[PDB]
Write a protein that holds these residues in place. Structure first.
Motif, PDB file in Angstrom:
ATOM      1  N   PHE A  82     -57.641  -5.738  29.685  1.00 13.18           N
ATOM      2  CA  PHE A  82     -56.534  -4.900  30.363  1.00 13.18           C
ATOM      3  C   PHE A  82     -56.006  -5.460  31.550  1.00 13.18           C
ATOM      4  O   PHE A  82     -55.430  -4.793  32.411  1.00 13.18           O
ATOM      5  CB  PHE A  82     -57.676  -3.597  30.826  1.00 13.18           C
ATOM      6  CG  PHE A  82     -58.130  -2.962  29.905  1.00 13.18           C
ATOM      7  CD1 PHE A  82     -57.447  -2.282  28.724  1.00 13.18           C
ATOM      8  CD2 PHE A  82     -59.872  -2.667  29.725  1.00 13.18           C
ATOM      9  CE1 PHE A  82     -58.236  -1.744  27.725  1.00 13.18           C
ATOM     10  CE2 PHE A  82     -60.223  -1.995  28.783  1.00 13.18           C
ATOM     11  CZ  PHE A  82     -59.441  -1.390  27.861  1.00 13.18           C
ATOM     12  N   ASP A 102     -60.195 -10.571  30.433  1.00 10.63           N
ATOM     13  CA  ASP A 102     -60.283  -8.968  30.303  1.00 10.63           C
ATOM     14  C   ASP A 102     -59.049  -8.614  29.428  1.00 10.63           C
ATOM     15  O   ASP A 102     -57.706  -8.863  30.053  1.00 10.63           O
ATOM     16  CB  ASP A 102     -60.073  -8.595  31.950  1.00 10.63           C
ATOM     17  CG  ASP A 102     -60.068  -7.087  31.809  1.00 10.63           C
ATOM     18  OD1 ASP A 102     -59.770  -6.396  31.107  1.00 10.63           O
ATOM     19  OD2 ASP A 102     -60.605  -6.544  33.086  1.00 10.63           O
ATOM     20  N   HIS A 127     -58.153  -1.021  34.663  1.00 12.27           N
ATOM     21  CA  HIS A 127     -58.758  -0.313  33.964  1.00 12.27           C
ATOM     22  C   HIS A 127     -58.293   1.270  34.458  1.00 12.27           C
ATOM     23  O   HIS A 127     -58.505   2.057  33.430  1.00 12.27           O
ATOM     24  CB  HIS A 127     -60.221  -0.310  34.348  1.00 12.27           C
ATOM     25  CG  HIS A 127     -60.784  -1.562  33.942  1.00 12.27           C
ATOM     26  ND1 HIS A 127     -60.370  -2.794  34.229  1.00 12.27           N
ATOM     27  CD2 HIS A 127     -62.003  -2.016  32.845  1.00 12.27           C
ATOM     28  CE1 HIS A 127     -61.102  -3.733  33.746  1.00 12.27           C
ATOM     29  NE2 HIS A 127     -61.891  -3.119  32.897  1.00 12.27           N
ATOM     30  N   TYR A 187     -54.022  -7.704  39.702  1.00 13.27           N
ATOM     31  CA  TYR A 187     -54.759  -6.308  40.237  1.00 13.27           C
ATOM     32  C   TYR A 187     -54.718  -6.256  41.644  1.00 13.27           C
ATOM     33  O   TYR A 187     -55.018  -5.222  42.460  1.00 13.27           O
ATOM     34  CB  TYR A 187     -56.339  -6.635  39.752  1.00 13.27           C
ATOM     35  CG  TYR A 187     -56.663  -6.482  38.417  1.00 13.27           C
ATOM     36  CD1 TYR A 187     -58.074  -6.230  37.858  1.00 13.27           C
ATOM     37  CD2 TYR A 187     -55.655  -6.036  37.405  1.00 13.27           C
ATOM     38  CE1 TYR A 187     -58.542  -6.222  36.676  1.00 13.27           C
ATOM     39  CE2 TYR A 187     -56.232  -5.916  36.097  1.00 13.27           C
ATOM     40  CZ  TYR A 187     -57.408  -5.867  35.890  1.00 13.27           C
ATOM     41  OH  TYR A 187     -57.900  -5.682  34.500  1.00 13.27           O
ATOM     42  N   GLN A 195     -60.771  -3.051  39.751  1.00 14.77           N
ATOM     43  CA  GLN A 195     -60.528  -2.476  37.974  1.00 14.77           C
ATOM     44  C   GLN A 195     -59.328  -1.909  38.178  1.00 14.77           C
ATOM     45  O   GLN A 195     -59.098  -0.719  37.350  1.00 14.77           O
ATOM     46  CB  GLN A 195     -61.600  -1.125  38.225  1.00 14.77           C
ATOM     47  CG  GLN A 195     -63.082  -1.632  38.029  1.00 14.77           C
ATOM     48  CD  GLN A 195     -64.161  -0.735  38.352  1.00 14.77           C
ATOM     49  OE1 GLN A 195     -64.348  -0.356  39.709  1.00 14.77           O
ATOM     50  NE2 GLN A 195     -64.411  -0.003  37.222  1.00 14.77           N
TER      51      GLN A 195
END
Ligand SMILES: Nc1ncnc2c1ncn2[C@@H]1O[C@H](COP(=O)(O)OP(=O)(O)OP(=O)(O)O)[C@@H](O)[C@H]1O
Ligand SMILES: Nc1ncnc2c1ncn2[C@@H]1O[C@H](COP(=O)(O)OP(=O)(O)OP(=O)(O)O)[C@@H](O)[C@H]1O
Ligand SMILES: Nc1ncnc2c1ncn2[C@@H]1O[C@H](COP(=O)(O)OP(=O)(O)OP(=O)(O)O)[C@@H](O)[C@H]1O
Ligand SMILES: O=C(O)/C=C/C(=O)O
Ligand SMILES: O=C(O)/C=C/C(=O)O
Ligand SMILES: O=C([O-])C(=O)[O-]
Ligand SMILES: O=C([O-])C(=O)[O-]
Ligand SMILES: O=C([O-])C(=O)[O-]
Ligand SMILES: [Mn+2]
Ligand SMILES: [Mn+2]
Ligand SMILES: [Mn+2]
Lengths: 554, 554, 554
Positions: free
Chosen positions: C198, C196, C106, C156, C103
């Motif tokens: 983000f 996604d 996020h 990420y 995440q």
């Protein structure tokens, strides 16, 4: 890539390009409007300089002007020097640099270098931490006690380290940002400076207590602590006593050498070697008399012995061919004047009669070579010169003391009084000499500037940890090996000064090959082509692009 | 309080103190080691400067040296100027500044001022935003078309706004950081500069299209957008056509004036006002003849009229006493040469006979006052001067064109040829004149430097929005009111140049009092003591402490 | 020294001390007024942190809070970590760092590390030149294709290099300013991320063309060009194919290693070496079966072989005791699934029967040690565990896949199903397990965090050029030699995680001594006492004085 933009780019001489900043650089870096609309090339800038210099009269005025550019536009400064190093050498280096130092406080405008005073003892590191550059690789330090043959000039001596380092870049292409001129101020014994309202140092006589040695120690440690243990540290213009003891004390602990002892030794040998090629004289028939017995004399003698030894002579027999005459007279066993351990090997049993003057020494000893390194003026009198010419067919006469006024004799005196039979060299420049028969003789300059630039570059590029005497013996050979037969016939004992850049690089190449061959180099990986490696590492005076990397994404 | 520490404090001339940085400042600001151990006072520094200057020979050499200090140590620069403004004025101002401009590109070292070129049209704001100072209060801008009486020098004309602003500070104590020299570059018609490789401007003839006017508009807008609508903008050395139209166009919209039309107008009047007190002459008997009919002539004539009007004469009557003779001859109704609306009021019915030369004009009109403002050289010939001496007992002769070579005549010529009966003044400096009878005459300098510094200070401190002609009338009275009876007898038509600082401050004081009385000042709160307020606001050349505020907590 | 003052010192987490800035520092550095009057100690600050942490509920929330401190006050960040590394490790490292990564887009607040994308090909050096630190000594880089056992997380994955380097400092005292986290972005094949909004990387699938290899090459060259040829480069979480390829390609050219192949290999071996001591089992009776045959399996197997060889077994004999079972089944000669050169040495003639599941493999081969390293979840099923307990008196079971959910089995499962007879270790942390008889077992964590910190410190301090496999064998011995007999009886296969700091330093000391003894260290001078040298070089979390050196002159 640079972190600052706007006005700061122009205020910092390292980055400032003046009107050479491109339109794109100006717009992107926030300089639009701060410069005249004109976009200039470095060529035009160089032309502007030469145009102005030509209108100037005094050497000092020229020194202030050119050195002023080092503080305005560094790139341009070295471009200018590079355009005609031979004609500017006399201005930025000996003899003018000597005049600059004697009046350093009067011509001051901006400080240059790092200043460490005895009053800063215990806080040297904080001073070293104030230097803006973080990748220093070479340091030239002086304490101003023996500036050339001028004596104790104290802080005014800073002009020397500054000058030496300019030559590091101009001669060997060593990066300017990696150089750091340093002045150790522990006071001065020069009474005139202590009464000068413009003196730039501490108003006290020289501290000669343990505090002096401790400060130098703190200096060595501070420099290496921040920049590295192999940071090159060139001691320059320290007094006799201190010069030797510091060399002996630090040469095996740090990467250091004394220019006056070792640098001067290499250049002198190089000249003697060149002279041997034109005269083809028997090493056994060599009788060398030194006028002086200090830093230069001892340095030179030692290198000469190392050379004679590698040439089939025993250390003892080589030393016997060398005599020294200091301010008290001939160095002979049992004399009244003191003789230390360094001088002992050249102190022989008193000859038949004891000379009073150097002239007497020449007539009694009948030397084949005479080397002037007393920094005390015209000691090679017309009678001394004639003596050498009546005794030898081709006398070798070296007047190495700087600046010009301190030289043992002039080129004109040597060539004319020996009827053009002498092989001459000096520390300070003299123009060509024409005798009554029309023959023209071009005196070579036996100045360490032919050595320290190339030796520094090699030592730096090889990350050498310590410098042995043999390194200087090699530099000497590398220097003389660059002489062409044509040049030898000209009476030149050294390659032309106009080619000092190429000469220094070749020396650097020869010395790095020597370092690698003797396990004194620690760079990895080891480049296969040493010559190519050294040439590729040299700093260039051409402007670099300061444009940020801009490009489109797929 | 400064936001910078370390080397940058030394690289920035505004903050750099050289060896004047105290030990504490050096230790706290990270300068220790970057400066020689020596701690100096500004006095010693000023001494070093005067010592070096004294050894220099040419005025240009001195100009380069002093102006160079402005880029190294600003405080010292002004200290030096303030030490002896009278002896340096000829070097940083007329006539040397004219020589400097003529070869500006040849003596270039560092740029000074803001440069806005026609090629930057539509992007002037971004250029203005590049200026490092955030509180500009005054701007002196030129386009280099009418540099003194030297003509179109283009970007080389930048030397003028720079000099004017140095005087803003030196003469009126206006903060240097609040001043901004500006050069508008739209090209140049000077063929010699277009072929000069060192030219600092665009290589094109002047753009005389709508683009020119639009660029000037963008300039005015950009400066005021960033700094405020009341920012003082002093137009300097613009060509005749442009000078007037821009003054008329912007005087009611912005805080602006033209030094050449209004500044020069006030100095001239001031001298005439002084002359009136030495000879007590009724202005009904004053007949004034101008050599020239441009910026200065029209400016001076208009102020003169205003002076006669407030002294009991009708505008019509006053204008009739004024005649002008330009490059085509006498301005008379119905002449072939053009006559615009500004010249019309001074264009009268042709006299009995029409003059061919200025000499003829003098003999036919029999003026009592002659004002040279043609910027064309020695037009006030010995015969012209003799004519004025035979026609008048005490002729008034003003040779205001600059630089010296453009002056209508010298002080020597004026005093000698009129047998010491003339009241003389010039724009450029002349030494005292001693006649055969032993009488010594000291010529006054009717140059606007006596006016713009004081007017600028008053306008700035009063946040004045617009400058009326009346302000210059007042400035003129303020200048002359400072003359002492003893100085009048000396042949002084202006206060001694050596006292220009206090003279400028007093003018500033008188002008601010005038601004308040006429609701033209907008300062809150309104100081009760204007004189005290003005003097307290002046920038000083004394070094300021840069030490951080350190203290103990209870 | 500090070159910055004012607000900037507070905005830079590297220097910011919050209320810990002393009164003197605030006054002298221009911070007075920008901080509350309160002067605090790091102790109080640490208390504030622990007070707040205690009130938080989720691991991710805690991760965001602590990692946020690294961007506010670096000194405090590490102090916090040092206070209780054992309880925070699960938050800043596995398993929470796995969640953070999934995440990352996020929870993003501030970027950390250097990002190099395929779209920057040909411009990598300019990106490397943007990194603010000039003395980088270590780099941890990932391309995010194999993040833990989570798969392709693209950009990420940057959370990994960031976490790993936080541990360089927290565990080994390596300077944070000398560490550089790097994420190579060539796209991602994770469909979910590509949709996604983000996502923090390029929206394209992985570029597997020649351009990929070229980019990595440019990366290696750029990093070493700026920081040095010996710059440590730790490859982390690269896909299987690339991991080996780049290790083989760069290990003899640069100072580099792959944490997942070599780091994991050393910690696993160390666990086995510890187990050796608790059960005194003969290497001849050692039958090892790997669940997986990739980066970890091959790395561990190779190191185990080196260990057995060094202990009297031939390479062949040792390899014969090792079997591997990947996703296609048992690695046996002639199977359909591919077998590369690395796996060949562990690919033996098919046994009596060919197993379908890992359970079958255990029953057919009857291994005494089982090592789970397939990053595919609970493959060590209850039946697999029971089989090991029925076949062996003291089975060795290692479930090394991270994060927790990817582990082959939990500690609870292992100890209960084997009735406390197994020797268990896992990659992710599990709390102690208590059986029904009341016996408590403390599972050790065989995670490379016990190895890379100490190895990195040694390689950096010794200026090591390349890292051999033997260096990891040594690290493994160094790790296990830290265990006390007392601990061994407690089920301990690794020193307590709470002692990770001293454990890492000691590993660093043993490795450095190994490097010197095998001519792999290049530091000078060589310290006499290695242990003392290493301990003196460690970075400390205690605040340093930022006060300028102020002192009186004599
Ligand atoms: N008048 C003199 N006659 C002969 N020798 C002198 C005379 N004056 C000085 N000397 C000698 O010159 C030597 C100077 O040694 P010192 O170490 O001070 O400098 P140096 O390294 O020779 O200097 P330089 O840089 O000039 O070569 C001393 O041995 C000194 O005795
Ligand atoms: N040779 C000449 N004889 C008489 N008048 C001249 C002569 N040459 C030029 N002039 C006049 O001098 C005037 C110059 O006006 P301009 O606006 O260019 O400058 P200015 O500001 O009046 O003068 P200065 O530059 O001296 O301050 C013009 O009216 C021009 O006709
Ligand atoms: N379900 C499975 N059953 C048995 N083996 C598996 C299974 N799933 C994957 N594997 C094997 O696990 C190995 C993973 O190797 P890879 O190089 O991708 O990562 P790794 O570094 O070994 O794993 P980790 O870092 O999670 O310990 C492969 O040999 C693969 O065939
Ligand atoms: O030619 C230039 O732009 C700079 C000259 C100087 O700095 O002297
Ligand atoms: O006297 C000084 O310190 C400075 C001189 C200069 O900038 O020229
Ligand atoms: O001191 C000297 O003369 C030198 O270094 O050249
Ligand atoms: O232009 C001029 O001559 C002046 O301003 O003095
Ligand atoms: O990849 C992993 O699981 C690791 O490095 O710990
Ligand atoms: Mn020297
Ligand atoms: Mn003007
Ligand atoms: Mn990993």
């Amino acid at each position: 890539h640079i972190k600052e933009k706007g006005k700061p780019l122009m205020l910092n001489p390292r980055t400032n390009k003046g009107m050479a900043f491109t339109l794109q650089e100006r717009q992107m870096l926030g300089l639009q409007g701060l410069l005249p609309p004109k976009i200039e090339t470095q060529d035009i800038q160089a032309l502007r300089f030469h145009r102005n210099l030509k209108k100037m009269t005094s050497p000092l005025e020229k020194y202030i002007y050119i050195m002023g550019i080092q503080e305005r536009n560094e790139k341009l400064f070295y471009r200018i020097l590079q355009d005609d190093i031979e004609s500017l050498m006399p201005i930025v280096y000996t003899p003018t640099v000597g005049l600059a130092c004697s009046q350093y406080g009067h011509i001051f405008r901006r400080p240059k270098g790092l200043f460490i005073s005895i009053s800063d003892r215990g806080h040297v590191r904080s001073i070293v931490d104030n230097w803006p550059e973080n990748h220093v690789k070479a340091v030239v330090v002086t304490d101003g006690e023996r500036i050339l043959g001028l004596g104790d000039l104290g802080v005014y001596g800073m002009g020397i380290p500054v000058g030496k380092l300019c030559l590091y870049t101009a001669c060997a292409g060593i990066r300017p940002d990696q150089c750091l001129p340093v002045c150790i101020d522990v006071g001065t014994d020069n009474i005139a400076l202590l009464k000068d309202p413009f003196y730039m140092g501490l108003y006290q006589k020289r501290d000669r207590t343990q505090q002096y040695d401790d400060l130098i120690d703190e200096f060595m440690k501070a420099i290496t602590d921040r920049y590295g243990r192999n940071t090159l540290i060139q001691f320059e213009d320290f007094g006799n006593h201190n010069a030797f003891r510091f060399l002996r004390k630090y040469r095996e602990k740090y990467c250091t050498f004394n220019d006056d002892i070792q640098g001067t030794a290499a250049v002198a040998l190089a000249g003697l070697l060149a002279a041997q090629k034109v005269i083809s004289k028997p090493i056994s028939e060599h009788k060398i008399l030194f006028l002086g017995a200090g830093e230069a004399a001892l340095g030179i003698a030692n290198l000469i012995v190392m050379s004679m030894v590698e040439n089939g002579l025993s250390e003892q027999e080589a030393q016997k061919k060398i005599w020294m005459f200091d301010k008290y007279g001939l160095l002979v066993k049992g004399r009244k004047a003191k003789i230390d351990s360094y001088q002992e090997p050249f102190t022989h049993s008193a000859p038949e009669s004891i000379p009073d003057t150097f002239e007497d020494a020449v007539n009694i000893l009948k030397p084949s070579t005479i080397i002037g390194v007393a920094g005390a003026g015209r000691l090679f009198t017309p009678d001394v010169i004639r003596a050498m010419a009546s005794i030898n067919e081709r006398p070798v006469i070296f007047a190495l003391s700087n600046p010009t006024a301190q030289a043992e004799c002039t080129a004109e005196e040597a060539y004319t009084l020996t009827e053009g039979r002498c092989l001459f060299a000096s520390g300070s420049p003299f123009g060509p000499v024409k005798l009554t028969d029309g023959r023209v003789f071009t005196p070579g300059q036996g100045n360490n500037v032919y050595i320290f630039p190339g030796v520094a570059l090699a030592v730096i590029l090889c990350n050498t940890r310590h410098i042995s005497d043999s390194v200087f013996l090699e530099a000497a050979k590398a220097l003389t090996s660059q002489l062409t037969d044509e040049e030898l016939a000209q009476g030149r004992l050294y390659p032309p000064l106009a080619n000092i850049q190429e000469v220094s690089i070749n020396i650097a190449i020869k010395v790095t090959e020597y370092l690698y061959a003797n396990k004194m180099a620690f760079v990895y990986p080891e480049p296969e082509d040493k010559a190519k490696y050294v040439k590729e590492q040299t700093w260039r005076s051409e402007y670099d692009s300061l444009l940020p990397d801009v490009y489109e994404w797929p």
